[PDB]
Structures are given as C-alpha cells and as structure tokens.
RNA sequence: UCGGUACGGUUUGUGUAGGAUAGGUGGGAGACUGUGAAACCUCGACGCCAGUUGGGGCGGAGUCGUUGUUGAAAUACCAC
C-alpha cells in the first residue's frame, strides 16, 4: 500500500492474458524492486472438494530443484551411513541422534529415518513437528531406500494440496533464477496437475491461474497454452 | 430508479492475548517512513464478539515496521 508497492510492477496490465514466456519476464521485473523471496503460483481449479473422490492431492518432480539448501539429517546405522552421504546429506547420524535433536542442534531442514530406527522416531517429532523438520512416511521421507530418500528433499518435489475453496498453492523457486530454469519448473507442474485430474471435475478444469513473487499484483496467466512452457 | 450476471476495488467474521489464533489456505526475515499518547471523520455501518480501529482532511518530521509462535499458520503481512 506504499509508493514502493505500486512501483513494483507498475506496467503489468489486468486485461491482457500473458504467456508463461511473458510471465517469466515480468517475474524478473517484479523482482527488480524488492529483495529475494519465494515465487508463489496460485491456481483456481474447477473442482469441488465437498466430495471425497474429487479431492486433489499429489506431487511433482521439479527439474531445477526448489531454491532451498535442504540439509538432511539421516538416522543412519550400518550400511545406511555409506549410502546417505553418497547422495548429498551433510548430516550422517547414529543411534545417539535422539540427544542431538532434543539437545539444541537443529541445523538442518528435514529428518529421514530407517526402519531399524522407527521405534525411536516417536520421541523426536514433538519438537520438529511444528518446525516442519519431522520424518513423515506419508510424504515419502521414511523408507529403507536412503539412496533416493535423500534425493527426495534434494530434488525439491513440492507437495501441494488444494484448499477448502478449490485453490492451489505452488512454488517454482527463488525470484533471482533464470527465465529458462523457472519455465521448466513451472511447465512440469501443469504437465502433472492435468495427469492427476479427477474423473468427475465438471466444467473447465484450470480456469484461473496467476504467478506473483515479490510484493505486487498477480500476473494474468493464460490457461489456454499448455504446450509451449519453454 | 429497482434487481440478476460477469469482471474489478475496499470492508466485515475469529472460544482466548500482545494487530478478539489481523477469516480459511499456502508462502514467508523483510516490509514501512514511520512523534499519535492525539486533535479533524471519534473505525466509515457495527460499538454485542473487547478494543477490531481515527484507514492520514497530520508531517515525509523524527521514537508504535522489526518484537512474544506460550492458540487447532499467530508475527518476519502478504505473491488468494
């Protein structure tokens, strides 16, 4: 509501549909005013989450990561210590990793355990739960295959979830990225949202969609172009 | 003049507190030029939820932005 608020993207038009080629350009020009932040994508789906079978929940593999450091703490014992450090996780724990979590050493981003440690994970997730650093088997951060479980956090697969009022929330990374590296992250989601379209979504599926990143209005994005994201 | 629809803008709700968990939901350490106890709308209905708020007819003139997560996102206020 300031002068610098309207100075950011003072040239974007409301009554003009923009391609993702043009939306990647204006996302750079929106970032020309303020500091670095996380690019946010808002999609208005044409679904109804009142029915249970029309609930939309999935994931997508981004080609260019997520713009996060993604430090991974691994409950690694036995052969798990050699297979977790070979993937990219800087923290290789042990059986005594319980004391290092409740003792004041929280310098990571996600905790990934092994089934030989799952009898002791229940004393951990009470302090990493609301912080967002707890192990979760429902989202793919608890498995015995630690060679690719670490690559799940390193790959940057964003877990989106449609709300009570049929709206999506997706991220493609930082605002200081290239226009081509953000076009492949953005083009991969819509390549996989339509694959997870429910079988009883009446009307037009992806009706309204916008991308804004740094302290301004939303770019009017065109739903009608789903072939030329790059 | 009285309505219906589409699009666009503001505002209203929240057992319980510091912006009545500043609605629901996701992002998120940077947004603001700010004396504000206060005079000029006494928040612009409402003044019951109890203090939401005078959002600038002040002053670009500097000391309420930052801060407590103790509540079923509180915050670093917005990318709905």
Curated annotation (Swiss-Prot):
Q: Which Gene3D superfamilies match?
A: 3.30.190.20, 3.40.50.790
- Gene Ontology cellular-component annotations: cytosol; large ribosomal subunit; peptidoglycan-based cell wall; plasma membrane
What PROSITE patterns is this protein classified in?
A: RIBOSOMAL_L1
Q: Which organism is it from?
A: Mycobacterium tuberculosis (strain ATCC 25618 / H37Rv)
The source's superkingdom equals Bacteria
Nuclease in keyword set: no
Q: Name one GO molecular function term.
A: rRNA binding
**GO biological process terms held by the UniProt record:** regulation of translation; translation
Its name, as the record gives it, is Large ribosomal subunit protein uL1
Q: Which family does it belong to?
A: Belongs to the universal ribosomal protein uL1 family.
Tell me the Pfam families matching this sequence: Ribosomal_L1
């Amino acid at each position: 509501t300031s002068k610098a608020y309207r100075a950011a993207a003072a040239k974007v038009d409301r009554t003009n549909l923009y391609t993702p080629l043009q939306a990647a350009k204006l996302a750079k020009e929106t970032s020309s005013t303020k500091q670095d932040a996380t690019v946010e994508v808002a999609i208005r789906l044409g679904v109804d989450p009142r029915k249970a079978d029309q609930m939309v929940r999935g994931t997508v593999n981004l080609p260019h990561g997520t713009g996060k450091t993604a430090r991974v703490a691994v409950f690694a014992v036995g052969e798990k210590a050699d297979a977790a450090v070979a993937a990219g996780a800087d923290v290789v724990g042990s059986d005594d990793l319980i004391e290092r979590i409740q003792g004041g050493w929280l310098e990571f981003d996600a905790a990934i355990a092994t089934p030989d440690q799952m009898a002791k994970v229940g004393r951990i997730a009470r302090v990493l739960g609301p912080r967002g650093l707890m192990p979760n088997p429902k989202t793919g951060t608890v498995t015995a295959d630690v060679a690719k479980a670490v690559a799940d956090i390193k790959g940057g697969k964003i877990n989106f979830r449609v709300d009570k009022q049929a709206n999506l929330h997706f991220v493609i990374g930082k605002a200081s990225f290239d226009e081509k590296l953000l076009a492949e992250n953005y083009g991969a989601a819509i390549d996989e949202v339509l694959r997870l379209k429910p079988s009883s979504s009446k009307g037009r599926y992806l009706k309204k969609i916008t991308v804004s990143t740094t302290t301004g209005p939303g770019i009017p994005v065109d739903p009608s172009i789903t072939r030329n994201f790059a």
